[PDB]
Symmetry: C2
Subunit: 94 residues, 2 copies
């Protein structure tokens, strides 16, 4: 409850017990800061929703599509070539 109130104060959660980011999601979608919404959904744990958001953003305005193709590689193996490489290589992002 204290965490809920803190998140509400932070602007992510609206009033009420309705824990649904669809309000902030649509607000960001109209706002145009697509990357921030993608990060928030990732925090909200909606991977395919973030994929749809990034694809729609690419429908707006190229690099985003390839970023999303990297995003489709969500693998949790401890001996990971994909994680051995992209984890270092992500530094080139702007």
């Amino acid at each position: 409850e204290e965490r809920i109130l803190a998140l509400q104060l932070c602007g992510w959660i609206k009033k009420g017990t309705d824990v649904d980011v669809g309000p902030f999601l649509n607000s960001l979608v109209q706002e145009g800061e697509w990357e921030r919404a993608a990060a928030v959904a990732l925090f909200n744990l909606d991977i395919r929703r973030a994929i749809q958001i990034l694809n729609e953003g690419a429908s707006s305005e190229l690099n985003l599509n390839v970023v999303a193709m990297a995003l489709s590689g969500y693998t949790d193996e401890k001996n990971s070539l994909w994680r051995e490489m992209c984890s270092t290589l992500r530094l080139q992002l702007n």
Copy 2:
């Protein structure tokens, strides 16, 4: 023997072809040629080098995604966005 002769005439072999392609600057064609020879880490190295010489690193760390699972998100996503890429 017929296949070897055909590939020799095709220009893929007379390594040296990889060096020639890298020198020519065709990072995309070089990476594709490597992948056609099934060397994933070589292709990743080539893509990173060409990126250092903001979409090439994106495609590189994306292609470093390799999933053999039937319904893995990687396969369907890359298939869908294969058309989208340029």
